[PDB]
Design an enzyme around this catalytic site. Sequence first.
Site, PDB file in Angstrom:
ATOM      1  N   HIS A  42      33.006  28.073  37.443  1.00  0.00           N
ATOM      2  CA  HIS A  42      33.542  29.314  38.626  1.00  0.00           C
ATOM      3  C   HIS A  42      32.727  30.559  38.747  1.00  0.00           C
ATOM      4  O   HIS A  42      32.639  31.536  39.263  1.00  0.00           O
ATOM      5  CB  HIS A  42      34.944  30.059  38.820  1.00  0.00           C
ATOM      6  N   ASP A  88      36.386  24.165  33.486  1.00  0.00           N
ATOM      7  CA  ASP A  88      35.511  25.439  34.427  1.00  0.00           C
ATOM      8  C   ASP A  88      35.071  25.556  33.153  1.00  0.00           C
ATOM      9  O   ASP A  88      34.826  26.413  32.286  1.00  0.00           O
ATOM     10  CB  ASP A  88      36.743  26.800  33.940  1.00  0.00           C
ATOM     11  N   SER A 185      35.182  36.144  32.211  1.00  0.00           N
ATOM     12  CA  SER A 185      34.533  35.500  32.596  1.00  0.00           C
ATOM     13  C   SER A 185      33.419  34.684  32.500  1.00  0.00           C
ATOM     14  O   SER A 185      32.376  35.188  32.575  1.00  0.00           O
ATOM     15  CB  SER A 185      34.975  34.812  34.483  1.00  0.00           C
ATOM     16  N   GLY A 186      33.299  33.676  31.292  1.00  0.00           N
ATOM     17  CA  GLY A 186      32.552  33.046  31.168  1.00  0.00           C
ATOM     18  C   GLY A 186      32.405  33.113  30.057  1.00  0.00           C
ATOM     19  O   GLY A 186      31.360  33.056  29.219  1.00  0.00           O
TER      20      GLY A 186
HETATM   21  O1  LIG Z   1      41.790  34.630  40.636  1.00  0.00           O
HETATM   22  C1  LIG Z   1      42.251  35.534  39.929  1.00  0.00           C
HETATM   23  C2  LIG Z   1      42.048  36.535  39.822  1.00  0.00           C
HETATM   24  N1  LIG Z   1      42.781  37.428  38.587  1.00  0.00           N
HETATM   25  C3  LIG Z   1      41.854  38.616  38.437  1.00  0.00           C
HETATM   26  C4  LIG Z   1      41.891  39.802  37.188  1.00  0.00           C
HETATM   27  C5  LIG Z   1      41.285  38.829  36.609  1.00  0.00           C
HETATM   28  N2  LIG Z   1      41.512  38.207  35.369  1.00  0.00           N
HETATM   29  C6  LIG Z   1      40.915  37.488  34.021  1.00  0.00           C
HETATM   30  O2  LIG Z   1      39.897  36.819  34.914  1.00  0.00           O
HETATM   31  C7  LIG Z   1      41.835  37.556  32.879  1.00  0.00           C
HETATM   32  C8  LIG Z   1      42.689  38.152  32.617  1.00  0.00           C
HETATM   33  C9  LIG Z   1      42.704  36.769  31.013  1.00  0.00           C
HETATM   34  C10 LIG Z   1      41.216  35.497  30.821  1.00  0.00           C
HETATM   35 CL1  LIG Z   1      41.259  35.042  28.969  1.00  0.00          CL
HETATM   36  S1  LIG Z   1      40.419  35.891  32.187  1.00  0.00           S
HETATM   37  C11 LIG Z   1      41.695  37.433  37.217  1.00  0.00           C
HETATM   38  N3  LIG Z   1      42.985  35.037  39.228  1.00  0.00           N
HETATM   39  C12 LIG Z   1      43.516  33.440  39.042  1.00  0.00           C
HETATM   40  C13 LIG Z   1      44.751  32.955  39.217  1.00  0.00           C
HETATM   41  C14 LIG Z   1      44.400  31.923  39.098  1.00  0.00           C
HETATM   42  C15 LIG Z   1      43.845  30.552  39.527  1.00  0.00           C
HETATM   43  N4  LIG Z   1      44.178  29.058  38.968  1.00  0.00           N
HETATM   44  C16 LIG Z   1      44.485  28.943  38.231  1.00  0.00           C
HETATM   45  C17 LIG Z   1      44.804  27.708  38.410  1.00  0.00           C
HETATM   46  C18 LIG Z   1      44.151  26.865  39.777  1.00  0.00           C
HETATM   47  C19 LIG Z   1      43.771  27.082  40.713  1.00  0.00           C
HETATM   48  C20 LIG Z   1      43.798  28.479  40.661  1.00  0.00           C
HETATM   49  O3  LIG Z   1      43.032  29.400  41.957  1.00  0.00           O
HETATM   50  C21 LIG Z   1      42.308  31.350  38.929  1.00  0.00           C
HETATM   51  C22 LIG Z   1      42.638  32.429  39.205  1.00  0.00           C
HETATM   52  F1  LIG Z   1      40.749  32.981  38.763  1.00  0.00           F
END
Ligand SMILES: O=C(CN1CC[C@@H](NC(=O)c2ccc(Cl)s2)C1)Nc1ccc(-n2ccccc2=O)cc1F
Lengths: 233, 52
Positions: A42, A88, A185-186
């Site tokens: 992603h 992922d 991420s990653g």
């Molecule tokens: O897009 C975001 C935005 N967030 C806002 C803050 C960021 N937080 C993080 O990346 C993390 C927190 C803990 C970890 Cl480990 S990574 C990501 N979050 C989500 C939520 C849910 C999801 N989904 C999960 C499963 C199936 C489909 C999805 O879309 C993806 C995201 F990136």
Amino acid sequence: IVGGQECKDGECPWQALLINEENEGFCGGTILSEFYILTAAHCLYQAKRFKVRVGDRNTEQEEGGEAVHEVEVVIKHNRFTKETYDFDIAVLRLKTPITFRMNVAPACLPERDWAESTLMTQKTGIVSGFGRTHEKGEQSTRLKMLEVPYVDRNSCKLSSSFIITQNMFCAGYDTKQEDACQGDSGGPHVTRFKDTYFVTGIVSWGEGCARKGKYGIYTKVTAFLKWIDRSMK
Amino acid sequence: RKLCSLDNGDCDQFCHENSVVCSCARGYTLADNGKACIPTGPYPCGKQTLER
Ligand SMILES: O=C(CN1CC[C@@H](NC(=O)c2ccc(Cl)s2)C1)Nc1ccc(-n2ccccc2=O)cc1F
Ligand SMILES: [Ca+2]
Ligand code: NA
């Protein structure tokens, strides 16, 4: 990374950063060898063109070890999708090899059965990154790391608005304000065993950062161990 | 009778079970004693970089 601490000198050497055309960090990577970087699939959509930087602890301070490497090939897991965030995982091959040195070195890949019976059963893993320091916050110029407890799969499933597949695992805290966050991420999730660090996860996703009742979600690397091998050859 | 479930069968890294076999990640060589893992280079995977 929300909470945790600054990675001290030489303590997160497998850390890589994927950098925007504007040379901004947006995702992490884990060094696997001189030619390969593990990251999240992603992360591949969030930037058209990018490179990978290593050996850096302070984006605002040229230490003298930095080295910026262009990507020769991208190998995305062909089953990954934005819809599910499942599978992922992705490997990058670098045009030019990394030279291991202070603050630049690879993490070990474990044997699968042993990693399941011995690594995944530890109390904690370590995640690191240059990502935000609170949800609505901004990226940290210094490389941070954070010890995150393994969270049991049933609790993981129950706490989540989204489906958690077997290619995923939970880490972090229910209420305690510590977690990976946006920009990590990653990046690596590694597990220590007798002073050796083994890759166990890839920062994947979360519903916010450090939210109560929510955990950090990671790619389960034990499920992609043969895949990483083939991806590297 | 050693088992991987007791001090990882005395292995430094990988353990596998009617007796226990230790092994090591790429970049290390299994010691003569069948337990320890020896780095074949200065930057072996999974080692923090402290001296040098
Ligand atoms: O897009 C975001 C935005 N967030 C806002 C803050 C960021 N937080 C993080 O990346 C993390 C927190 C803990 C970890 Cl480990 S990574 C990501 N979050 C989500 C939520 C849910 C999801 N989904 C999960 C499963 C199936 C489909 C999805 O879309 C993806 C995201 F990136
Ligand atoms: Ca720097
Ligand atoms: Na939480």
